Amino acid sequence: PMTEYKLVVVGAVGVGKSALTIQLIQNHFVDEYDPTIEDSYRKQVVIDGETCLLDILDTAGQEEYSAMRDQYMRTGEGFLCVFAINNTKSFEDIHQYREQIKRVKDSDDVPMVLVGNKCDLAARTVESRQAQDLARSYGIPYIETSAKTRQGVEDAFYTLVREIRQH
Amino acid sequence: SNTIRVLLPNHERTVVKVRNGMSLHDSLMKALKRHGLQPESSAVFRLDWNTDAASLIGEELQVD
Ligand SMILES: Nc1nc2c(ncn2[C@@H]2O[C@H](COP(=O)(O)OP(=O)(O)NP(=O)(O)O)[C@@H](O)[C@H]2O)c(=O)[nH]1
Ligand SMILES: [Mg+2]
């Protein structure tokens, strides 16, 4: 009665990919910004009455990601594209990450979830209705999360698992 | 390369960067607490914590 899902967290350099991951695992938000290279975490949860084993990957950005991005995109089965609502450069990169994933998977229907992190800060640079239209063109859900207040953090990861489970 | 990959229990793993003349314990101390593990209770499989970090470039080690 065990089902194992492999999750991949991609995004810009500073959008809270590790903060969202640590908040789900440790239930603890880290204030200091430490760049992460490649970290894999495991956790067994219960989603809709089914015990699921989750393998989450913490990818990096910039040149370190540029070279070694094509390998883990072929291994993972669900991608949690994360952007921060406090910088627009990260939201503009979301298109580039999907094109690389779709080119690796050689398919136009890959389980993905658009996530606007850092939704606890005022003066957002990216309105919600913007990311709604983007996720609509991709055929994927859109959740606003905050790794500091774990707002919608459990809802985001569980939604990506449901996108895999129903795929 | 300045990159070193490390494996962890429960099918976890992490990749840490090292510098010239860095301690094994002092180079990955943040990654151990980030995954949730103390270096006192940790066990590298085998080597010593006083081993140079740059001296282990290109190899993979496990922790228990
Ligand atoms: N208010 C707020 N700040 C956040 C949130 N998530 C991250 N931050 C801030 O942004 C910093 C960077 O977080 P981090 O997880 O390192 O970003 P990242 O996308 O994983 N980059 P990397 O993968 O290189 O570690 C955090 O240290 C924190 O100060 C959030 O949900 N809300
Ligand atoms: Mg990180």
Side-chain angles (χ1 to χ4, degrees), chain A residues 1-5 7-29 34-37 39-43 45-61 66-67 70-73 75-88 90-91 93-94 97-101 104-105 107 109-126 128 130-147 149-167, chain B residues 3-4 6-16 18 21 23-25 27-28 31 34-36 39 41-44 51-59 63-64:
Chain A
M2 261 298 188
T3 312
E4 184 262 2
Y5 304 97
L7 304 185
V8 180
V9 182
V10 298
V13 185
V15 294
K17 302 183 302 298
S18 56
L20 288 172
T21 305
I22 297 177
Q23 182 64 214
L24 175 62
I25 300 298
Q26 310 278 332
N27 294 94
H28 149 67
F29 177 72
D34 184 18
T36 62
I37 302 298
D39 308 75
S40 177
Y41 308 88
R42 193 178 238 182
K43 184 184 182 185
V45 302
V46 173
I47 304 176
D48 300 324
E50 283 187 343
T51 305
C52 300
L53 185 63
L54 303 184
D55 281 332
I56 308 177
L57 178 58
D58 192 324
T59 66
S66 168
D70 305 68
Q71 51 169 340
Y72 57 73
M73 289 180 180
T75 301
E77 59 203 47
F79 304 92
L80 194 66
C81 305
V82 180
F83 75 95
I85 69 162
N86 81 320
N87 73 312
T88 311
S90 64
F91 183 78
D93 292 5
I94 297 300
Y97 275 98
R98 177 185 174 271
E99 300 298 324
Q100 187 178 9
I101 292 176
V104 164
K105 308 261 78 176
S107 176
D109 183 66
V110 181
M112 293 173 295
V113 167
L114 183 58
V115 168
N117 198 17
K118 303 184 180 179
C119 77
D120 58 85
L121 305 175
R124 71 220 324 277
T125 186
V126 177
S128 177
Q130 294 171 315
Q132 296 167 7
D133 299 359
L134 184 64
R136 188 182 315 180
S137 61
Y138 296 164
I140 56 179
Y142 169 57
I143 317 292
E144 276 195 6
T145 66
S146 169
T149 60
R150 66 184 299 101
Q151 165 67 24
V153 165
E154 286 190 355
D155 193 8
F157 283 87
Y158 295 166
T159 303
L160 179 56
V161 178
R162 294 186 180 98
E163 288 290 326
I164 302 177
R165 184 182 60 184
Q166 305 301 139
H167 174 256
Chain B
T3 79
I4 295 189
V6 180
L7 281 71
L8 297 175
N10 208 344
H11 285 62
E12 294 188 357
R13 56 179 175 87
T14 183
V15 180
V16 299
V18 305
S23 177
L24 198 159
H25 154 71
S27 60
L28 48 85
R34 167 155 32 89
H35 281 257
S41 60
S42 303
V44 183
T51 312
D52 187 11
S55 178
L56 311 181
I57 285 177
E59 299 176 352
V63 185
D64 280 310

